[PDB]
Amino acid sequence: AKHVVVIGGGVGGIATAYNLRNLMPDLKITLISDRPYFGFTPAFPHLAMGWRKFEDISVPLAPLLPKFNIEFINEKAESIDPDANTVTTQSGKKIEYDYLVIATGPKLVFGAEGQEENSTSICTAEHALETQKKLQELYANPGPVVIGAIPGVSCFGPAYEFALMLHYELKKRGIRYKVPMTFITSEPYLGHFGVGGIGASKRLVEDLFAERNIDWIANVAVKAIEPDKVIYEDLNGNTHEVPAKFTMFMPSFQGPEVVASAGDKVANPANKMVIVNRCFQNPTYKNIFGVGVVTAIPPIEKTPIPTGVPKTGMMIEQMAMAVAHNIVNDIRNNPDKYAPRLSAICIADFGEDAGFFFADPVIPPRERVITKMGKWAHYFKTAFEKYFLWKVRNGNIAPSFEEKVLEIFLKVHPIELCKDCEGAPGSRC
Amino acid sequence: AKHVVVIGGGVGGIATAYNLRNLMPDLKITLISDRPYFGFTPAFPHLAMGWRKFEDISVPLAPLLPKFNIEFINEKAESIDPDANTVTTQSGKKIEYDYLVIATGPKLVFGAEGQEENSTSICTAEHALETQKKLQELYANPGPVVIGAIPGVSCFGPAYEFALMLHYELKKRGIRYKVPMTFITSEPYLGHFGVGGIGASKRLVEDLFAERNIDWIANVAVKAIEPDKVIYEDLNGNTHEVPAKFTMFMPSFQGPEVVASAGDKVANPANKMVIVNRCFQNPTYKNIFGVGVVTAIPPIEKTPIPTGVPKTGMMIEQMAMAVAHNIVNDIRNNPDKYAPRLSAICIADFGEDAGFFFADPVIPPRERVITKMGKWAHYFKTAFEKYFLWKVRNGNIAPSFEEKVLEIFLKVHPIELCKDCEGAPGSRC
Amino acid sequence: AKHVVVIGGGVGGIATAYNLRNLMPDLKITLISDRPYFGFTPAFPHLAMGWRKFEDISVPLAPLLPKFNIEFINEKAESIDPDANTVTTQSGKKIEYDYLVIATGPKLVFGAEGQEENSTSICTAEHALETQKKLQELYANPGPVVIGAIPGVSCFGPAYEFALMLHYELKKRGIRYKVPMTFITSEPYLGHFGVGGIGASKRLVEDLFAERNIDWIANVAVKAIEPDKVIYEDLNGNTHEVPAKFTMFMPSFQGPEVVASAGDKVANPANKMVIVNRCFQNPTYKNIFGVGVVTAIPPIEKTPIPTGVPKTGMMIEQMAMAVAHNIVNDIRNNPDKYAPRLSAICIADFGEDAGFFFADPVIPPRERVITKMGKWAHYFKTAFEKYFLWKVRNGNIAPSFEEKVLEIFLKVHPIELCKDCEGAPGSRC
Ligand SMILES: Cc1cc2nc3c(=O)[nH]c(=O)nc-3n(C[C@H](O)[C@H](O)[C@H](O)COP(=O)(O)OP(=O)(O)OC[C@H]3O[C@@H](n4cnc5c(N)ncnc54)[C@H](O)[C@@H]3O)c2cc1CS
Ligand SMILES: Cc1cc2nc3c(=O)[nH]c(=O)nc-3n(C[C@H](O)[C@H](O)[C@H](O)COP(=O)(O)OP(=O)(O)OC[C@H]3O[C@@H](n4cnc5c(N)ncnc54)[C@H](O)[C@@H]3O)c2cc1CS
Ligand SMILES: Cc1cc2nc3c(=O)[nH]c(=O)nc-3n(C[C@H](O)[C@H](O)[C@H](O)COP(=O)(O)OP(=O)(O)OC[C@H]3O[C@@H](n4cnc5c(N)ncnc54)[C@H](O)[C@@H]3O)c2cc1CS
Ligand SMILES: CCCCCCCCCCCCO[C@@H]1O[C@H](CO)[C@@H](O[C@H]2O[C@H](CO)[C@@H](O)[C@H](O)[C@H]2O)[C@H](O)[C@H]1O
Ligand SMILES: CCCCCCCCCCCCO[C@@H]1O[C@H](CO)[C@@H](O[C@H]2O[C@H](CO)[C@@H](O)[C@H](O)[C@H]2O)[C@H](O)[C@H]1O
Ligand SMILES: CCCCCCCCCCCCO[C@@H]1O[C@H](CO)[C@@H](O[C@H]2O[C@H](CO)[C@@H](O)[C@H](O)[C@H]2O)[C@H](O)[C@H]1O
Ligand SMILES: CCCCCCCCCCC1=C(C)C(=O)C(OC)=C(OC)C1=O
Ligand SMILES: CCCCCCCCCCC1=C(C)C(=O)C(OC)=C(OC)C1=O
Ligand SMILES: CCCCCCCCCCC1=C(C)C(=O)C(OC)=C(OC)C1=O
Numbered sequence A, B, C: 001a002k003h004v005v006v007i008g009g010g011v012g013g014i015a016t017a018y019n020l021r022n023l024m025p026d027l028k029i030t031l032i033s034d035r036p037y038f039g040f041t042p043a044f045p046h047l048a049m050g051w052r053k054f055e056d057i058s059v060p061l062a063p064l065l066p067k068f069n070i071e072f073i074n075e076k077a078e079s080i081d082p083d084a085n086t087v088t089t090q091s092g093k094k095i096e097y098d099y100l101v102i103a104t105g106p107k108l109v110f111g112a113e114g115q116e117e118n119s120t121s122i123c124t125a126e127h128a129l130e131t132q133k134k135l136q137e138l139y140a141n142p143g144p145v146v147i148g149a150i151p152g153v154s155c156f157g158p159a160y161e162f163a164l165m166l167h168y169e170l171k172k173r174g175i176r177y178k179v180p181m182t183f184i185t186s187e188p189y190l191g192h193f194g195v196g197g198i199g200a201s202k203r204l205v206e207d208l209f210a211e212r213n214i215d216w217i218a219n220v221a222v223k224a225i226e227p228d229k230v231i232y233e234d235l236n237g238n239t240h241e242v243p244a245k246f247t248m249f250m251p252s253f254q255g256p257e258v259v260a261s262a263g264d265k266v267a268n269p270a271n272k273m274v275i276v277n278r279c280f281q282n283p284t285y286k287n288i289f290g291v292g293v294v295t296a297i298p299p300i301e302k303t304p305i306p307t308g309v310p311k312t313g314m315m316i317e318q319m320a321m322a323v324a325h326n327i328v329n330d331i332r333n334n335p336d337k338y339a340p341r342l343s344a345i346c347i348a349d350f351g352e353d354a355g356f357f358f359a360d361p362v363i364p365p366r367e368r369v370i371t372k373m374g375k376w377a378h379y380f381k382t383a384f385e386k387y388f389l390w391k392v393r394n395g396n397i398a399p400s401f402e403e404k405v406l407e408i409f410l411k412v413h414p415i416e417l418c419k420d421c422e423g424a425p426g427s428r429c
Helices: A011-023 A041-048 A125-140 A157-172 A201-211 A313-331 A375-394 A400-410 B011-023 B041-048 B125-140 B157-172 B201-211 B257-261 B313-331 B375-394 B400-410 C011-023 C041-049 C125-140 C157-172 C201-211 C313-331 C375-394 C400-410
Strands: A003-007 A028-032 A037-039 A058-060 A071-073 A077-081 A086-089 A094-096 A099-102 A107-109 A145-149 A181-184 A215-217 A221-225 A229-233 A239-243 A246-250 A252-254 A288-290 A338-340 A344-349 A354-360 A368-374 A415-417 B003-007 B028-032 B037-039 B058-060 B070-073 B077-081 B086-089 B094-096 B099-102 B107-109 B145-149 B181-184 B215-217 B221-225 B229-233 B239-243 B246-250 B252-254 B288-290 B338-340 B344-349 B354-360 B368-374 B415-417 C003-007 C028-032 C037-039 C058-060 C070-073 C077-081 C086-089 C094-096 C099-102 C107-109 C145-149 C181-184 C215-217 C221-225 C229-233 C239-243 C246-250 C252-254 C288-290 C338-340 C344-349 C354-360 C368-374 C415-417
Touching: A003 A011, A011 A028, A011 A099, A011 A313, A041 A125, A041 A157, A041 A375, A058 A375, A099 A313, A125 A157, A125 A246, A145 A157, A157 A181, A157 A246, A157 A344, A181 A229, A201 A215, A201 A354, A201 A368, A201 B201, A201 C201, A221 A246, A288 A313, A313 A338, A313 A344, A313 A415, A344 A375, A354 A375, A368 A375, B003 B011, B011 B028, B011 B099, B011 B313, B041 B125, B041 B157, B041 B375, B058 B375, B077 B257, B099 B313, B125 B246, B145 B157, B157 B181, B157 B246, B157 B344, B201 B354, B201 B368, B201 C201, B221 B246, B288 B313, B313 B338, B313 B344, B313 B415, B344 B375, B354 B375, B368 B375, C003 C011, C011 C028, C011 C099, C011 C313, C041 C125, C041 C157, C041 C375, C058 C375, C099 C313, C125 C157, C125 C246, C145 C157, C157 C181, C157 C246, C157 C344, C201 C354, C201 C368, C221 C246, C288 C313, C313 C338, C313 C344, C313 C415, C344 C375, C354 C375, C368 C375
Parallel strands: A003 A028, A003 A099, A028 A071, A099 A288, A145 A181, A145 A246, A181 A215, B003 B028, B003 B099, B028 B070, B099 B288, B145 B181, B145 B246, B181 B215, C003 C028, C003 C099, C028 C070, C099 C288, C145 C181, C145 C246, C181 C215
Antiparallel strands: A037 A058, A077 A086, A086 A094, A107 A252, A221 A229, A229 A239, A338 A415, A344 A354, A354 A368, B037 B058, B077 B086, B086 B094, B107 B252, B221 B229, B229 B239, B338 B415, B344 B354, B354 B368, C037 C058, C077 C086, C086 C094, C107 C252, C221 C229, C229 C239, C338 C415, C344 C354, C354 C368
């Protein structure tokens, strides 16, 4: 009767726990999370826009997880002793494991001076709801809006979505002509996304912004967010300011102190993210796996202003699939190990229409991309929200038909047999 | 029995006078203009191309204006005394006013050395007719053509139209492959138009010029026009030259001496254009209004080579509606004041097809834009020409149906209630 | 009967010889070529891909040319004595002529250090076959690919074709995700082609490279190709390095030693190409004509990294028609002389689809361009290949219907009466 502990009750943690449970009924699974609910992160921009109720995009874990025989501990994990195979919670409870899955998501870094106090963010439900309050303040007395991403950001999509959604909302309110909008990014160009673009995404987003009168500044470092302005620095070292009554900036991500508490063989010395190989397994502690945003994946491109690689939902579901198979196979002494494909279907909701991006794989060189836009993509976004929430509530994040459908439509194979796990995650084995 | 004097028998003056007349049949209205005719400015490029007869795009005003009980004086206004509420003509007639509307249009400044003598222009009917004479010389003895805008230009559209029309003509004459064409502009890029661009106008005009082999140089200052060359200076201060048998350049605009004659409270000290507020009313002398190109509107953006804001026909028409309502409301002891929306439908005629640009408002931030191209837009431009000419001859520049049609097709409302006129024209109340 | 010697058994030489034969049945015509076959050059990229067999895109000349009363000498022409009106072959045979047509094609210069040794090329059948052999090694052991053009290149299309064909092949083999691809060119931008672009060719090729994940570097000078990497220099003089396991670079072109042997009135000092006027006749020796790539045509523009003008198939067929008429008219004491239009239909085959480019003329000012892309263009490329080879085998490179069909579809007339032959080739009479 083996014991896996999963740290984090989000996309990566839930998917891995559910996968493990469905692969191995005879396996003990403990999920530890500091939030009592699963939060559907792709709906956080909508929540900030006041287009969702929190209750409709979240799932209480305590009455749910026991239905699938998973023990839920609603506590923050404080430290990991990888030599002892132990996790210690904030309350001091020490829980021993045979396998550990770290899926804590991003630790948010508000790197611009004054950002956390003066700006808004949409990365958590709590921050999103705070943003909504500030937006109601904006509608009552319109002023300049600045949205974007600071240096080191690795999740750019929600910023683009939020900007376009806000444009949509101001337009519906008839006050868009009273609200200047500017997008400022650390990406070397619009639609880079920390992935070197997806097809002609640069041309697509530039045209989208031109059509919707969203001014933009790319390839710069946002250095300060003041109550009245945003200050950014270009590559020449020249500083510029842009007026702003309302701002929404993406923080950069780093790993949590719980990961840092394990050795420098577990926590990447540069960013505290979980050191993993191609099989998303720690190179030194073979019973530790990382799933999701918390995993240390090298940037696709060293950009003039530092940027990182996104870990999207599909990428994370593929990691979860690989990790679950990797743990089960180790338990059963099956030598087969899996690397996730790390392909992605991504949809950027703009209001009534949406951008559809497919990248296979996300990390270049690519076999295939799809870049489309239309109303259909918006409805697909909403439909997938309903679908995924159902999956969380029904104990299977990987129903057999889903993989078949993705294979039928997009030739996707989520995981590959990996003959040698040694190497950076995302590198081809 | 109140008295309004309108200076200028063009788009702004005629529109304001007609609006006032339809609003207030009992009002005394005197129109002062140095030209005996209304000239339909949007057909001056066509006139230059020899595609119009002068008689077909102009309306004699002396026989016409008495039909709508408007007094017409065919004289140049020489000076304005704002403290005496008087206007003096070149002969010496002192006309007293209760309200004054200044709508003298552009005073042309041929800022490049040799520009007035060696180049051509299409800004007046007289200038356009001379350009046709010079085009015949070009067809007879083919050589290099260069067209564009000098520094400080605010009306770029007709230069693009003219270039494309001339290409069209050259090609029809079978001499295009014998005539090099170069477009040189103070705009930071093609399709800036002095408005920071309209939707994807940059991309659109670039592709247009590329498909038609029109070479271009942007973001430079034309310094001299010689009989055989055009000299321009780049941002690095370096001088360059281009061969030219025929040229056509836009002059920059300033305010007239008649506006300068009034206070520095009326004449903008930097350009002699009329100081107006959001309601197109002088801040100091509240019975003075400005309508049209003569109004001092700040640049949308300060460009590397100085560039100013166009005042297009639709913009002028909205100014005229706003100013007419503001005068009448003052007469009727009504506190309600209006600002024009300053939206624009602009059609650049290219010959057989045309570019259609809609910006609402022209001064950002914008509610929406439409950028289209096709044969239909050329037929629309010709149709509108006939329509507007008819409106001039029939005494109503703003028939009720037109506002309703614009509303249902483009979501345009021409004027808005302004709670606080205090501010720059085009800035939001 | 008079005697014409044609040096070169390629597109230009065959076209001129056949044009002369059909114009003048009694004319004695001798063709001298070092290759025993006509090679269909536009199928050489396909030969390099292994998509053609050599015998399917070549025609043995010795048994063919006598059927058209053309004497074939399968020898390299070694020298030309223009004063004695003689050509000497490598074996020392002296051939006297009344008129001489020089059509020896490009002499290849592998200007980058280690290029001929470490890279591949597709400019001859023999080189393309070596490339095919090295490609097999890339599929077996996938790694970084870099393709492009060194400084002074004048034929860029085949590099674009080969890059996109290789992408197609790798995607066919399902190994494109293992092969980084980078395009490096002397062109100031993508789709310049040594002609200053064709319509929106830059925008088209950029979007295409983006859609297919082909990275690119333009406006640089490739200095060295090592087994390990490509070294290039930017315009600041800074050297850069890009990793490469397989490369394919275009060489630059010069003229041959046989041309150099005729002295500096015939051989251009800078490149050893044939000095010709508008009528493709040598200015000094009026009985010497040049046809094809070997002709000295000035560049369309001096680019920051030097590039030259392509001589495409259609341009060369037009040169051939003009030269044949010019020779025949001299014989018959007809003072009419012709210049080629020098327009170009260019199809860049990308595998399963293709880019269609049409420029009329290629050298600006242009009457028109067409830039299109689709599957249809690939099928036309294949169809044209079959059609041209048929024409070689059947003794008519200029069937009357082809000129009519080109007139109907593209409004092209291949040659024009030239009232003054004196001037640069491509300059307007
Ligand atoms: C705003 C936003 C939008 C967004 N939209 C996306 C989209 O439309 N498509 C898509 O594919 N991806 C989108 N993403 C990215 C990504 O899918 C999300 O960031 C995921 O949520 C990432 O999943 P993870 O499992 O990596 O992280 P998580 O946040 O869902 O879950 C972490 C859980 O861990 C808990 N926790 C943190 N620290 C803990 C400690 N010390 N101890 C116990 N538990 C801990 C935490 O409470 C949570 O339950 C989008 C991304 C964004 C965000 S900026
Ligand atoms: C060449 C050209 C083309 C052009 N095309 C346009 C278009 O296709 N669409 C569009 O929307 N706008 C276009 N414009 C711009 C604008 O619509 C025109 O410039 C208007 O003509 C501007 O209207 P205004 O009322 O501002 O000026 P006006 O020139 O029409 O009339 C001024 C009248 O005043 C007289 N006048 C001058 N000075 C006087 C004194 N001192 N005293 C008495 N009267 C005076 C003058 O004679 C005239 O009747 C386009 C613009 C252009 C031009 S560059
Ligand atoms: C790889 C490649 C592709 C290519 N594709 C083209 C295309 O798709 N469309 C198009 O319009 N043009 C394409 N071109 C360019 C051009 O059409 C070709 O280069 C032509 O082959 C040029 O014709 P030429 O007659 O100029 O040259 P040639 O190579 O066909 O023939 C020369 C003949 O002369 C012989 N020869 C050389 N030296 C000699 C001496 N000293 N004595 C006697 N004979 C000599 C030689 O053997 C040959 O028979 C494309 C171009 C390319 C290539 S990079
Ligand atoms: C159950 C299946 C779930 C698996 C997900 C499959 C992913 C595959 C998505 C890639 C294919 C895109 O899918 C399709 O793209 C086209 C091209 O823009 C869209 O666009 C099409 O329909 C719209 C609306 O009727 C038209 O205005 C448009 O002219 C037409 O091109 C379609 O509405 C969309 O259905
Ligand atoms: C009744 C008077 C009109 C009031 C002015 C209203 C202006 C209309 C602006 C609305 C924007 C829609 O603009 C619309 O776009 C389409 C899309 O290319 C245009 O073009 C379309 O119709 C034309 C008809 O000749 C077709 O030949 C063409 O193939 C097609 O693309 C329409 O001609 C244009 O009307
Ligand atoms: C019979 C021999 C005649 C050929 C002579 C050579 C001259 C060639 C002249 C080229 C004329 C223009 O080329 C023409 O472009 C259009 C694009 O709108 C192509 O049309 C293509 O694209 C459209 C839109 O994606 C598709 O729906 C269509 O099925 C496809 O064929 C035509 O297939 C092509 O023939
Ligand atoms: C018959 C019911 C059809 C539902 C099955 C198809 C669901 C597959 C959705 C793919 C997808 C995944 C996995 C995914 O992770 C993701 O990111 C959040 C998407 O973007 C919205 C996706 O579209
Ligand atoms: C069905 C009846 C037909 C209604 C006709 C309404 C036409 C309204 C014209 C709008 C317009 C204005 C005001 C206008 O100023 C302008 O620029 C000069 C246009 O472009 C040519 C316009 O299209
Ligand atoms: C019945 C229809 C008759 C079709 C006649 C064939 C048209 C001739 C092809 C034109 C052409 C020429 C001359 C040509 O030289 C060329 O470059 C190699 C092309 O690109 C593929 C061409 O398309």
